[PDB]
Paper text:
Cyclic β-1,2-glucan (CβG) is a circular polysaccharide critical for host interactions of many bacteria, including major pathogens of humans (Brucella) and plants (Agrobacterium). The production of the main CβG chain occurs in the cytoplasm and is orchestrated by the cyclic glucan synthase (Cgs), a large, multi-domain membrane protein that contains several enzymatic sites. We determine the structure of this complex protein machinery and clarify key aspects of CβG synthesis, revealing a distinct mechanism that uses a tyrosine-linked oligosaccharide intermediate in cycles of polymerization and processing of the glucan chain.
In order to determine the structure of Cgs, we constructed a strain of A. tumefaciens C58 carrying an insertion in the chromosomal copy of the chvB gene encoding a C-terminal 3xFlag-tag (CgsWT). The CgsWT and CgsiGP samples produced high resolution maps of the full-length protein. The CgsWT map contains a disordered density docked at the active site of CY, which could potentially correspond to a glucan chain reaction intermediate. The CgsWT and CgsiGP3 maps obtained in the presence of UDP-Glc contain additional densities of glucan chain fragments bound to the protein at the cytoplasmic side of the CTD. This surface, which stretches between the CY and GP enzymatic pockets, appears to contain affinity sites capable of coordinating the polysaccharide. The first site, at the CY active site (CgsWT map), contains a disordered density. We found that an additional mass corresponding to 9- and 3-glucose chains is attached to the IF1-homology loop in CgsWT, while no such modifications were detected in CgsiGT.
Author numbering: 20 to 1528, 1536 to 1962, 1964 to 2012, 2020 to 2027
C-alpha cells in the first residue's frame, strides 16, 4: 500500500498526545510526505489538475469502459470536493496567511498550524475526528500554547492538505487506467500475427512500459490465462523483470496493493470532508481554547451574546498584537484592574465586569496602562469624537462651498447684477448638500467600522428583574377590525412566547367632540370578551398574559375634540405612571390592571411584525449594566447610558397580494439577507446616537424623568426626535422589524408632508437656546428642514433660471441640475463593486447591473416628474405650519382631518386631474410668463413643462395593480379550459369512493389489462383528497351537505386509523386497515397531512363563524359540465342510417341551456325559482341522450350519457344547496366547530423530535419501528418537498433555527441569473409549497420556479417532444403487471448520473406549472390531447419516449394508468389559478403558521457562485440491433426464442431445432462442417424449373445479395435475386407453444411471376439421446398422418407402455393471400432423398414425381407441403407456417382454431414483445449483455472452439473420470470454468450466474463452476462470501438431480482434479484479465481472420 498518499503507520489515540508533546520541544525534521512549495500557486495547480482528472473521466466511461471503485467517489461527489476547494482562499487572504509563525522544519520555514496538518492526515487513514484533534492539541499545548486565530485556522487548513492527497491519488489512478489498457491492444496485435520475428521489434518499443508495476498485471494475465498464449511473448517479461530481483509474483501482489488502499483513502477523503462540513467548530474551539479557560471563571463570559463574545476576543487580540505583551495575560491583567470596578448592581454582587474596561467606559485607561499604542485609524476616530458633531457638518458644508465657488466661476458670463446670484446659489446648494452628504456617508462606511452593543443571553427566556409589557398603541374603528387587532396581538405573543413577557393593547375611540358617546360600551364589551376568550386558550402557568388598557380622553385646552393629554406621548406617559403605582390616571374603571413592576415596555405598532425571539436580544442588551442609564443629577439627560435602543428596520417584499411598479421603484432596500451581520450608519459611528423613528425600548423611570422634565403640551407627533434626543439613542442594527409601503399614490405625499410639517414645527427648539435641545439634534432638525426645502429650491431655481438669464447655453444648467439628482443615489450603488484593494481573485459572479440601473433611472424620472406636485403640497404644509409657529394658532394638533386632499375614492385619471389642479397650472402659467421675454426660453421649456404637466397620468399608471403569483391575468378561455380539465379529472374520486371501509383514495388503477384497484393508502393521498374535496366545494360541483358527509367520514376513518406516537405508518390497507409491510414512518407523509389539515380546519372555521354567506357558492360547475358535454358531442361521428337529426336537436337544446344559464348568471339577486326550472331541462337532455344511446352501442355514447348524468346531479346538488332550511344554523355551527377541533388536534398531534439527528441537524429520511433506529440520511437540500414539514416542525416549537439555516442554498448558472440546485430535478419537488403556502414576487423560490419552468420549456423545445418531466410509471410491466414507479428529472438540475436516458413526459406536470405560466401549459396540454393521453377519468399517468422501450414504429408510448396521488394536485392548481389562490390564505390564516411565516421571503444574494460544469437527442438509451448482410461468407450466429418451456434455436441461415420441455421436435446434430440440419422452406420457380430456399442455405443461387436481422422477438431473413425478393420472419407465439414462420414476398417487376413454395420439417420425438443412439427405432415409431382439411399434418408416437410422455405435435399450412388452391404432402423422406442424393441435390424438386402423397406407418417419415402462389407485379402474397405442439391431442384442436383464421399473426408480435420485456425485466439483463450471452451460448452449443484453454496445457489432462468425485458429473454439461482470486470485485461471478439463469430460460443447459483459488488463510472466508450469493441457486431446481452450479476450494482438492477440470472446460476465464459481457466481444474482434469464392458457385 504505497500509492503516493501520506500514510505514517496509523497509531490511534494516546499516541497522538505523545507525538504532539514531543513535537512541542523537538520534532518534525522530516514528514511522511512533504515538499517545498508555495501556497497560492500550488492551490491553483491543484484546482487545474482536479478539474482535468474529472473532465477526462467524464468524457471516458461513456463510450464503454469499466470504472474503478476509487473513481466512483470522484465522479459521484465532485460537487462537495469543489466548495471545499472553495471556502479556502476565501478564509486565507494573503496578508492574513503571512502572520502565521515559522517552524523551520529542516532549512525551509513552514506555518506552524499547517505543519500539524501533515502530522495528522498521516497517522490515520485520511479520517478526521473531533476527539482525535482534541487529544492532539491537548498534547501539543504542553509547552507552547495556540493563540486565537491559529486555533481558528485548523478547520480551514486541514482541507488544504486533504485535497493535496486527493490530487496525489487521482493523478495516479487516472494514469493507472489508460496505461493498464495500453497492454490490451498490444497483446491483441501480438496474437493477431503468429510471427516470431516482428514480435521482437514490437516488444522493443514498450521496454519503457515494463517497469511500471501494473502493466505486467494485465498483460501477463491476458497472455497466460487468455487462450492461445505464446512461447515467446512471455519470454522477455520475466527476464526484464529480473532487474531488482522481484521474481514474478511480487509484482503480482504489488498490484493487489496500491488499489484497495487507493479506494479506501479516496472514500475516506469524501467522508472526512462531509464530517468537517457537518460538524460545528465554534463549540469545539470554545472547548479546546486555552485563553477561554481563564475567562470562564470570575467573569460572565458564558451568557454574553456569542457575537459580542467574539467582539471581546477581537478587542483582546488587537490589544495584544500591537503591544509588547503576550496574549494570555491581556485577558488576565484586565481582570485584576477590573476587580476594583466595584459590584455596582443588584445581580452583580459576585463576578467581575471585565467588559467595563475592554468595551466599556474605561477602555482608554486600559490601553494606556497596557502600553498599547493606538492605530492611526483609532487616533483619527478619537480626534473626531473629541471634536463633536462639528466634525460631521464641516465636510458637507466645505463640499457645498466648493461646488458653489465652481458654479459661480462657471456661471459668471451673462451679466448677473449680483442680486440674483445669491438666490440661485442658495437654491442650488441643497442638491449639492445632498451629494456631499451621500459622499460623506459612503466614505464613512468605507473607513469606519460599524457599532455593536453587548447583551445578555436569555436562553430560557427573560428572567426576573426585567419585566416587559408589550404596549401596542392601537386604534378602534371596529366592528370587525377588532378581530384582526387581536390576531396581531396573538401573532406578536407567538413571536416571543418564552420568558416572563406580558402583552396588552392601548387604544382610543377616535377624536369626538363629546367626552363619551356611551355607544362605545358594546364595542368595549366585545373587545373585553375577545380578551377573556384569548386568555382561556393559553391558560398556562396561571398567567393572565393578555391585558387591555383604554384611555377615557380629556378635552383639549384650545379646541377640536377630546384627544387626551396627547395623542400618543400622552398614552405613553399615563401608561408610564400607571406602572409606577399611580391610581388617578383617567383611563377607565375595571380595565385598569397592570402586572406590578414591568420595568420595560415595547413600543411597537398595530401593523409591524417582530422577529422570533427578537425581544430576548434587546432586553438583554439594555439590562446589561454597561447599557444601563445613569441620568445626570444636575440636569436629567443621561450623560453616560442608553435609555432608548432602536432596532434596524427593513421593508417587506410585497404588501400582501398587491405589488405595483410604484412599490418596486421607490424602495430599493427590500428583503432579508441572512449573511449581513451588521449595517453601518453615518450617525451612530460618528456621534453614538441614533434615531428613535417610531419603535424602540425605553426605561420607564428614565423616560419619565427626561420627558416630564422638559416636555410641554400642544406638540405634533414629532415627539420621536425630541424623545430620542432627551436621554440618548443607539441603533442596535441587530433586531429587525418589518413594515410596509403604500402602493397607491395618495398616502405617500400625505405622510411626507406630515413629517415636513413636524420638522418645521421643531424650528422653535432650534432657534431657542432655552428649553432642552442638543447641538447635534439641532443640526439634524436643520438637515430635515434642508431636505424639506430641496424641491422648492430646485423648482423655483429652474423657474428663475429659464427667465432671468435665457441664454443659448441654458441647456447646460438643467443638465447639471439633473446630474445632481443622478449623482445623489448612485454613490451608494458603487459600494458593491469595490474590491477593497484586490482582496482575492473572484469567481464567476454575474453582473446584473441592468436591474439597478433601470431602477435608478426610473426612480429619478418619477422624482423629477412628481417634484412639482410634492413641492406644491408640502409648501402648503409649510405655510400651514409657519402660521402656527408665528401667530400661534390652535390648529397645530391636526392628525388627518385636513380637507385639502380628503381622499375618499379609488384612483382614476378623472380624479387626480381634478383633485390636484394646482401644480400643472402653476407650471404652465410660469412657462407662459417666462416664455415671451427673451424669446429663447420656449425651446428649453417645452419638453420639461410637458413632462411636469403629465404628472397625474404617470401617477395613475404606477398606482395600478400588478400580478405576482395570485392576481395573474388569465382571461376566460384559459380559465374555462382549466376548470373543464379539473372537472373531468374529478370523476376519479366519484368513481372510486364508496363506503367499504373506504373514504381512502385507492392509489393507482390500471385500465387496459383487466383493470384492478390496488387497495393501498398513503397519508399524502388523504391530504390531497381533502384538498380536492375543498376545491370541489369551492367550484360548486358538490352540495353543502355532501362536503360535510365526506369530511366527517374521512375524519372518523383517520381517527380509527392506528397510529404510532401520533404519526402514521408508510403504507396501509384500504379494506383491512392493517399495516402492509414493515412498520416505517416517513417525515414527508406526516408533514403533508398536517399541512393540508391546517387548511381544512381553517376553512371549517371560516365557514363556521358565519355559516350563511358561504351556503350559495359560485354556480360555475354546471357550466363546466355543459362545456364537457359540448366537447364530447363534437367527437361523435354522424354518418349513419338516419343521418344526424338527434345530434342537431341535442345541439340546439344544449346551446339553449347554456344561454339560459348565462342569463341566470347575469342576474344579481340569484333567484332560487330560476334554477329549479333548469332541472327539467337537464332531465330532458338525459332522456334525449338515452334516446341517442338506445340505437348506437358505442363507448362514447356511454360517455355522453355519463356526462349528461353528472350534469343532472350537479343541478340537483345546486337545488339542494338552495333548499336548506336556513333558519337554525346553530347545529351546523356545532358540527363545523367539532370538525375544526378534531382537525386541528390531529394537526399538532405528531411529534417530530425523535426524527431530529442532533449531530448534523435536519430531518432523517424515515424511521423504522423495528430495532428503534433512524434510517441513515437526511433531506439535505432546500429543493426537497420536506421544506413544508420543516416549516411546520420549527413553527410548532420543537426545532431551532439552525435546522432551517443549514440546508441547501446552492446556485447553478442558467441564463443570466441562477436557480436552486436540485437532486433529481423534477418540479414534483418544487410545486407543493406553492400549492399550500404563499409566495411573493421578490422571494428566491418564485424566481427559481420561473427559471426552472423556462428551462423545462426550453428542454422540451430542444428535444422535440412536448415538455414536462416528473416521476411516474414508465412503460415497463413486471410479473402481474403494475407499470412500476421511479423518479425522473432534467440533467441540468439532477446531481444524479443517468437522468439523461429517460425521456418521460407526465401529463400532470403541465397542469402543475399552469400556475406560473398558464398559456404555455395550456398549449402543452392541448398538444398532449392531440396524442392519446386522455382516459376515462382524465389524463393518464405518463407517456414514454425512450427508443429502447418504444415498440414497433410508433413515435411514442402510452401508459394506461391513473394515480390518486397525481390527481388532487391538478384540481388544487386549477382552484389556485381560477379563484386567485383561495388556498393561499387558507393555510396562512392560522396564528401558529402565521407567526413563523417571516422565515420566508429573502432576496437572491446577488452573487451566484457558479461551480464546474444534438447531444440531448444523442443520449437517449438505445437497444442493440444485430444487422448482418451476408451470413454465408461469414461465421454463423445464433438467436434463441423461448416461452420458458418451449425453446427453439435459429442459426444464421435458418437452421436449428425446437426443444419442448427438454425433448426434441426436429432432429439436429452438431456438425461444424455441415450445418445443414433443421427445418427449411424451399421456393421453386415453375416456369424456369429452378428451386431454392428462403434462407437459400441448402441451395445457394448465384448472386445472393442477402441481409439478416436477428433482434429479439423476431428473426428477420432477407434475400433478393432476379428482381424477386423474399423476406421471412420467424417468431414463437405465446400461450400455445406455437412457432410461426411468416414468409413475405413482394414484386416490383413488370411481369407476372409463377413460383412455388415448399416446406420441409422432420418430426422427431425423443429424449435427445435415444434418437442419437439408435435412430431407426425413433424413426419407426413415428405415425405421421393427415386428416380432413388437408392443411394440418399431425404426428404422434404410438404408445408402448404407460410411462411414455406422448406430446402430440402437428404442423399447419394456413394458406393466405390466395383465392383457392389445394395443398399437397410428401410425408416420406425415402422418396424425398432418393437413395443416394442429399439435401443440396434433392429428388422431389425435379420434373415429375411431385408429392405422391404417401401417408401411414412410413419407414422414414417427414412433413412437407407445397403451395403454388400467384404473385403479379406490385402486389403482395403472404403465407404463414405454424409449428405447434401439445402434451395431448385434445389440446391441439384448442390451438388450431386460433391460427387457421386470417391474420392471426398481428396481436401476437406485440404479445411476444411484451413477454420478452417482462422476462428481461425479471432478471437484471441488458441488450448488449443479452447479445454477449447469446454469443456465449452459440459457443457452448456447437463444437466450435475459439476461447478455450491453450493447446499445450490441455494435452496432459482431461481424463474425464475425476469429475463425479467433485460432485460435478459433467455428463450432460458443456461446463463453464470461471476462475476468481481477488475477493475485491465479487461482481463478475454475479453477472455470470445472472447470465446462466438467463440462459436457463432459453433452453440452454450447462453448469456454472466457480473455482475458488485463494490460499487457505482467507479461503474459508472467500468460500462463505461466495456461498452467501450462490445459495440462492445451490438449492435444487423445481424437481430436476442437483442444480447446475458448483464451487470448489482450491486448497483442499488435488492438482490433478484442477488440471482435468481446466482441460475439459469449454471456456476458461479470469476475473482480473477481462470483464463479463466484455471478454465475449473481445474474442470477436480478435478471433477474426478464402471461403467466399465457392459461395456463389
Amino acid at each position: 500500500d504505497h500509492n503516493d498518499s501520506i500514510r505514517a503507520s496509523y497509531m490511534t489515540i494516546e499516541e497522538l498526545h505523545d507525538a504532539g508533546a514531543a513535537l512541542s520541544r523537538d520534532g518534525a525534521d522530516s514528514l511522511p510526505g512533504f515538499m517545498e512549495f508555495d501556497f497560492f500557486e500550488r492551490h491553483r495547480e491543484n484546482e487545474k489538475e482536479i478539474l482535468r482528472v474529472y473532465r477526462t473521466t467524464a468524457v471516458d466511461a461513456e463510450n464503454g469502459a469499466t470504472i474503478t471503485p476509487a473513481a466512483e467517489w470522484l465522479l459521484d461527489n465532485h460537487y462537495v470536493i469543489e466548495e471545499a476547494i472553495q471556502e479556502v482562499r476565501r478564509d486565507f487572504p494573503r496578508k492574513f496567511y503571512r502572520q502565521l509563525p515559522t517552524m523551520t522544519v529542516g532549512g525551509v520555514t513552514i506555518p506552524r498550524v499547517m505543519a500539524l496538518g501533515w502530522l495528522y492526515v498521516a497517522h490515520t487513514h485520511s479520517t478526521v475526528s473531533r476527539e482525535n484533534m482534541t487529544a492532539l492539541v491537548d498534547g501539543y499545548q504542553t509547552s507552547q500554547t495556540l493563540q486565537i486565530g491559529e486555533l481558528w485556522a485548523l478547520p480551514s487548513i486541514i482541507r488544504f492538505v486533504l485535497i493535496e492527497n486527493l490530487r496525489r491519488i487521482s493523478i495516479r489512478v487516472e494514469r493507472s487506467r489508460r496505461m493498464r489498457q495500453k497492454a490490451n491492444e498490444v497483446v491483441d496485435e501480438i496474437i493477431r500475427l503468429n510471427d516470431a520475428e516482428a514480435s521482437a521489434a514490437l516488444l522493443k518499443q514498450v521496454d519503457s512500459l515494463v517497469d511500471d508495476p501494473t502493466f505486467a498485471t494485465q498483460f501477463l494475465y491476458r497472455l497466460r490465462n487468455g487462450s492461445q498464449t505464446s512461447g515467446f511473448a512471455v519470454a522477455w517479461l520475466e527476464e526484464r523483470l529480473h532487474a531488482a530481483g522481484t521474481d514474478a509474483e511480487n509484482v503480482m501482489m504489488s498490484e493487489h496493493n496500491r488499489l484497495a488502499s487507493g479506494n479506501v483513502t479516496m472514500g475516506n477523503i469524501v467522508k472526512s470532508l462531509r464530517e468537517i462540513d457537518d460538524t460545528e467548530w465554534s463549540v469545539w474551539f470554545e472547548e479546546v481554547s486555552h485563553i477561554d479557560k481563564v475567562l470562564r471563571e470570575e467573569t460572565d463570559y458564558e451568557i454574553l451574546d456569542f457575537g459580542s463574545r467574539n467582539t471581546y476576543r477581537n478587542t483582546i487580540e488587537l490589544l495584544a498584537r500591537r503591544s509588547p505583551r503576550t496574549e494570555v495575560e491581556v485577558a488576565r491583567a484586565a481582570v485584576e484592574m477590573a476587580r476594583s470596578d466595584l459590584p455596582a448592581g443588584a445581580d452583580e454582587n459576585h463576578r467581575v465586569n471585565v467588559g467595563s474596561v475592554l468595551v466599556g467606559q474605561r477602555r482608554f485607561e486600559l490601553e494606556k496602562a497596557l502600553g498599547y499604542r493606538p492605530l492611526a485609524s483609532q487616533h483619527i476616530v478619537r480626534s473626531m469624537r473629541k471634536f463633536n458633531w462639528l466634525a460631521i457638518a464641516a465636510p458637507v458644508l466645505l463640499i457645498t462651498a466648493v461646488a458653489m465657488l465652481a458654479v459661480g466661476w462657471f456661471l459668471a458670463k451673462a451679466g448677473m447684477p449680483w442680486y440674483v446670484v445669491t438666490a440661485f446659489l442658495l437654491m442650488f446648494a441643497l442638491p449639492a448638500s445632498e451629494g456631499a452628504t451621500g459622499l460623506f456617508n459612503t466614505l464613512v462606511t468605507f473607513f469606519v467600522k460599524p457599532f455593536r452593543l453587548v447583551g445578555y443571553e436569555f436562553k430560557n427566556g427573560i428572567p426576573e428583574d426585567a419585566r416587559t409589557l408589550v404596549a401596542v398603541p392601537c386604534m378602534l374603528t371596529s366592528r370587525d377590525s377588532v378581530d384582526e387587532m387581536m390576531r396581531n396581538i396573538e401573532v406578536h405573543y407567538l413571536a416571543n412566547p418564552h420568558g416572563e413577557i406580558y402583552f396588552s393593547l392601548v387604544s382610543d375611540w377616535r377624536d369626538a367632540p363629546y367626552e363619551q358617546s356611551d355607544e362605545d360600551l358594546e364595542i368595549l364589551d366585545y373587545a373585553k370578551r375577545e380578551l377573556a376568550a384569548l386568555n382561556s386558550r393559553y391558560a398556562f402557568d396561571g398567567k393572565t398574559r393578555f391585558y387591555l388598557l383604554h384611555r377615557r380622553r380629556i378635552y383639549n385646552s384650545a379646541e377640536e375634540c377630546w384627544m387626551g393629554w396627547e395623542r400618543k406621548r400622552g398614552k405613553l406617559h399615563e401608561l408610564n405612571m400607571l406602572l409606577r403605582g399611580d391610581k388617578d390616571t383617567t383611563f377607565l374603571g375595571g380595565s385598569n390592571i397592570v402586572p406590578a413592576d414591568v420595568k420595560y415596555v415595547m413600543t411597537l405598532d398595530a401593523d409591524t411584525r417582530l422577529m422570533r425571539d427578537a425581544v430576548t436580544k434587546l432586553v438583554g442588551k439594555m439590562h446589561h449594566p454597561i447599557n444601563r442609564p445613569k441620568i445626570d443629577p444636575v440636569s436629567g439627560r443621561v450623560v453616560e447610558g442608553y435609555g432608548l435602543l432602536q432596532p434596524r428596520v427593513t421593508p417587506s417584499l410585497t404588501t400582501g397580494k398587491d405589488a405595483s411598479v410604484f412599490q418596486r421603484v421607490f424602495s430599493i432596500n427590500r428583503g432579508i439577507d441572512p449573511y449581513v451581520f451588521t449595517v453601518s450608519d453615518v450617525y451612530q459611528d460618528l456621534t453614538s446616537e441614533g434615531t428613535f423613528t417610531g419603535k424602540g425600548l425605553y426605561d420607564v423611570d428614565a423616560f419619565e424623568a427626561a420627558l416630564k422634565g422638559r416636555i410641554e403640551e400642544n406638540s405634533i407627533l414629532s415627539h420621536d426626535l425630541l424623545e430620542g434626543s432627551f436621554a440618548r439613542c443607539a441603533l442596535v442594527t441587530d433586531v429587525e422589524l418589518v413594515e410596509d409601503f403604500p402602493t397607491r399614490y395618495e398616502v405617500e405625499v400625505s405622510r411626507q408632508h406630515r413629517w415636513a410639517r413636524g420638522d418645521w414645527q421643531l424650528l422653535p427648539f432650534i432657534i431657542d437656546r432655552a428649553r432642552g435641545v442638543t447641538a447635534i439634534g439641532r443640526w439634524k432638525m436643520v438637515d430635515n428642514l434642508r431636505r424639506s426645502l430641496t424641491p422648492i429650491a430646485w423648482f423655483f431655481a429652474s423657474i428663475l433660471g429659464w427667465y432671468f438669464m435665457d441664454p443659448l447655453g441654458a441647456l447646460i444648467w438643467q443638465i447639471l441640475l439633473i446630474f445632481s439628482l443622478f449623482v445623489a443615489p448612485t454613490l451608494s450603488l458603487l459600494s458593491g463593486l469595490v474590491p477593497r484593494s484586490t482582496d482575492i481573485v473572484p469567481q464567476a459572479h454575474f453582473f446584473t447591473i441592468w436591474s439597478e440601473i433601470r431602477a435608478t433611472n426610473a426612480q429619478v424620472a418619477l422624482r423629477i416628474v412628481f417634484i412639482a406636485d410634492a413641492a406644491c403640497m408640502m409648501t402648503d404644509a409649510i405655510v400651514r405650519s409657519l402660521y402656527r409657529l408665528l401667530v400661534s394658532h390652535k390648529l397645530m394638533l391636526e392628525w388627518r382631518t385636513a380637507a385639502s386632499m380628503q381622499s375618499s375614492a379609488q384612483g382614476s385619471i378623472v380624479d387626480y386631474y381634478r383633485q390636484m389642479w394646482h401644480a400643472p397650472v402653476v407650471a404652465m402659467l410660469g412657462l407662459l410668463f417666462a416664455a415671451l421675454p427673451g424669446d429663447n426660453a420656449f425651446l428649453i421649456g417645452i419638453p420639461f413643462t410637458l413632462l411636469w404637466v403629465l404628472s397625474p397620468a404617470v401617477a395613475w399608471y404606477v398606482s395600478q395593480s400588478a400580478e405576482t403569483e395570485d392576481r395573474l391575468f388569465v382571461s376566460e378561455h384559459v380559465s374555462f379550459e382549466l376548470r373543464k380539465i379539473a372537472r373531468r379529472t374529478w370523476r376519479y374520486y366519484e368513481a372510486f369512493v364508496t363506503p367499504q371501509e373506504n373514504h381512502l383514495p385507492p392509489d393507482n388503477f390500471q385500465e387496459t389489462p383487466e383493470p384492478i384497484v390496488a387497495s393501498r393508502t398513503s397519508p399524502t393521498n388523504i391530504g390531497v383528497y381533502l384538498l380536492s374535496v375543498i376545491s370541489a366545494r369551492q367550484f360548486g360541483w358538490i352540495s353543502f351537505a355532501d362536503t360535510l358527509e365526506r369530511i366527517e367520514n374521512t375524519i372518523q376513518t383517520v381517527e380509527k386509523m392506528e397510529k404510532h406516537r401520533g404519526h402514521l405508518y408508510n403504507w396501509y390497507h384500504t379494506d383491512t386497515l392493517q399495516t402492509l409491510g414493515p412498520r416505517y414512518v416517513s417525515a414527508v407523509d406526516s408533514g403533508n397531512l398536517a399541512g393540508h389539515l391546517i387548511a381544512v380546519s381553517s376553512a371549517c372555521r371560516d365557514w363556521a363563524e358565519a355559516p350563511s354567506a358561504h351556503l350559495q357558492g359560485n354556480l360555475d360547475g354546471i357550466g363546466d359540465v355543459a362545456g364537457i358535454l359540448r366537447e364530447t358531442l363534437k367527437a361523435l361521428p354522424d354518418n349513419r342510417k338516419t343521418l344526424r337529426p338527434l345530434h342537431r336537436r341535442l345541439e340546439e337544446r344544449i346551446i339553449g341551456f347554456s344561454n339560459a344559464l348565462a342569463s341566470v348568471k347575469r342576474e344579481h339577486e340569484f333567484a332560487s325559482i330560476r334554477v329549479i326550472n333548469l332541472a327539467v331541462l337537464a332531465r330532458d337532455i338525459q332522456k334525449l341522450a338515452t334516446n341517442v344511446d338506445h340505437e348506437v352501442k358505442s363507448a362514447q355514447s356511454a360517455e355522453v350519457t355519463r356526462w349528461a348524468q353528472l350534469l343532472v346531479e350537479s343541478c340537483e346538488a345546486h337545488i339542494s344547496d338552495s333548499a336548506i332550511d336556513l333558519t337554525n344554523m346553530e347545529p351546523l355551527r356545532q358540527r363545523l366547530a367539532s370538525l375544526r377541533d378534531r382537525s386541528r388536534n390531529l394537526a399538532f398531534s405528531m411529534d417530530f423530535t425523535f426524527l431530529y439527528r442532533k449531530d448534523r441537524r435536519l430531518l432523517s429520511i424515515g424511521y423504522r419501528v423495528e430495532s428503534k433506529e433512524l434510517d441513515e440520511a437526511c433531506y439535505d437540500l432546500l429543493a426537497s418537498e420536506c421544506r413544508l414539514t420543516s416549516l411546520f416542525a420549527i413553527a410548532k416549537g420543537d426545532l431551532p433555527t439552525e435546522h432551517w439555516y443549514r440546508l441547501g442554498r446552492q446556485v447553478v448558472p442558467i441564463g443570466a441569473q441562477g436557480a436552486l440546485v436540485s437532486w433529481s430535478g423534477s418540479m414534483f419537488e418544487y410545486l407543493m409549497p406553492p400549492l399550500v403556502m404563499q409566495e411573493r414576487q421578490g422571494g428566491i423560490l418564485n424566481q427559481t420556479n420561473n427559471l426552472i419552468v423556462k428551462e423545462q420549456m426550453n428542454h422540451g423545445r430542444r428535444l422535440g417532444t412536448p415538455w414536462g418531466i416528473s416521476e411516474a410509471a414508465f412503460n415497463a410491466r413486471d410479473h402481474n403487471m403494475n407499470y412500476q414507479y421511479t423518479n425522473f428529472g432534467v440533467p441540468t438540475l439532477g446531481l444524479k448520473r443517468g437522468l439523461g436516458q429517460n425521456a418521460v413526459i407526465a401529463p400532470y406536470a403541465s397542469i402543475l406549472a399552469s400556475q406560473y405560466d398558464p398559456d404555455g401549459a395550456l398549449e402543452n396540454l392541448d398538444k398532449l390531447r392531440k396524442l392519446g393521453a386522455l382516459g376515462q377519468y382524465g389524463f393518464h399517468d405518463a407517456v414514454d419516449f425512450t427508443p429502447t422501450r418504444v415498440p414497433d414504429g410508433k413515435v411514442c408510448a402510452v401508459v394506461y394508468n391513473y394515480y390518486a396521488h397525481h390527481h388532487g394536485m391538478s384540481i388544487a392548481a386549477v382552484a389556485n389559478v381560477a379563484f386567485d389562490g383561495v388556498l393561499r390564505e387558507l393555510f396562512h390564516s392560522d396564528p401558529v403558521i402565521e407567526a413563523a411565516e417571516l422565515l420566508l421571503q429573502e432576496k437572491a444574494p446577488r452573487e451566484v457562485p457558479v461551480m464546474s460544469a444534438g447531444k440531448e437527442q444523442a443520449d437517449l438509451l438505445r437497444a442493440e440491433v444485430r444487422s448482418i448482410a451476408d451470413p454465408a461468407v461469414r461465421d454463423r450466429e445464433v438467436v434463441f426464442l423461448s416461452n420458458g418451456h418451449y425453446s427453439t434455436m435459429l442459426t444464421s441461415t435458418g437452421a436449428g431445432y425446437s426443444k419442448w420441455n427438454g425433448q426434441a421436435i426436429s432432429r439436429w446434430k452438431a456438425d461444424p462442417t455441415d450445418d445443414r440440419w433443421g427445418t427449411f422452406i424451399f421456393l421453386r420457380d415453375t416456369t424456369n424449373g429452378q428451386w431454392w430456399s428462403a434462407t437459400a442455405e441448402p441451395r445457394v443461387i448465384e448472386g445472393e445479395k442477402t441481409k439478416t436481422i436477428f433482434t429479439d422477438d423476431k428473426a428477420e431473413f432477407h434475400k433478393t435475386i432476379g428482381d424477386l425478393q423474399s423476406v421471412v420472419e420467424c417468431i414463437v407465439a405465446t400461450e400455445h407453444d406455437a412457432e410461426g414462420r411468416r414468409i413475405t414476398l413482394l414484386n416490383v417487376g413488370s411481369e407476372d411471376r409463377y413460383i412455388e413454395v415448399t416446406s420441409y420439417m422432420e418430426p422427431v420425438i425423443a429424449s435427445e439421446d435415444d434418437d442419437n443412439a439408435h435412430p431407426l427405432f425413433s424413426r419407426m415409431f413415428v405415425q405421421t398422418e393427415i386428416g380432413r382439411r388437408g392443411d394440418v399434418i399431425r404426428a404422434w408416437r404410438n404408445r408402448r407402455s404407460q410411462n411414455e410422455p406422448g406430446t402430440v405435435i402437428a404442423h399447419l399450412a394456413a394458406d393466405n393471400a390466395g383465392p383457392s388452391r389445394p395443398t399437397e404432402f410428401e410425408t416420406d423422406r425415402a422418396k424425398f432423398i432418393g437413395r443416394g442424393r442429399s439435401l443440396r441435390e434433392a429428388a422431389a424438386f425435379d420434373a415429375g414425381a411431385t408429392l405422391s402423397s404417401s401417408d401411414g406407418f412410413t419407414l422414414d417419415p417427414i412433413l412437407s407441403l407445397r403451395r403454388t402462389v400467384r404473385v403479379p407485379a406490385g402486389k403482395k402474397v403472404s403465407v404463414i407456417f405454424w409449428t405447434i405442439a401439445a402434451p395431448s391431442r385434445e389440446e391441439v384442436d384448442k390451438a388450431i382454431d386460433r391460427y387457421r383464421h386470417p391474420d392471426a399473426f398481428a396481436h401476437e408480435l406485440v404479445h411476444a414483445w411484451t413477454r420478452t420485456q417482462v422476462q428481461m425485466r425479471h432478471v437484471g439483463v441488458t441488450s448488449q449483455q443479452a447479445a454477449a450471452f447469446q454469443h456465449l451460448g452459440r459457443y457452448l452449443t456447437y463444437p466450435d472452439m475459439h476461447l478455450r484453454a491453450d493447446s499445450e496445457t490441455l494435452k496432459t489432462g482431461l481424463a474425464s473420470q475425476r469429475a463425479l468425485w467433485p460432485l460435478a458429473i459433467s455428463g450432460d454439461f458443456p461446463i463453464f470454468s470461471l476462475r476468481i482470486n481477488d475477493d475485491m470485485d465479487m461482481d463478475i461471478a454475479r453477472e455470470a450466474l445472472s447470465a446462466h439463469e438467463y440462459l436457463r430460460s432459453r433452453g440452454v443447459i450447462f453448469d456454472l463452476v466457480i473455482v475458488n483459488e485463494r490460499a487457505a488463510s482467507y479461503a474459508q472466508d472467500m468460500q462463505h462470501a461466495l456461498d452467501h450469493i450462490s445459495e440462492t441457486q445451490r438449492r435444487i431446481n423445481p424437481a430436476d438431480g442437483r442444480p447446475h452450479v458448483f464451487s470448489v476450494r482450491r486448497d483442499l482438492m488435488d492438482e490433478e482434479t484442477w488440471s482435468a477440470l481446466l482441460a475439459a472446460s469449454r471456456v476458461v476465464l479470469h476475473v482480473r484479465n477481462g470483464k463479463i459481457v466484455d471478454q465475449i466481444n473481445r474474442a470477436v474482434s480478435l478471433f477474426a481472420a478464402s471461403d467466399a469464392a465457392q459461395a456463389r458457385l
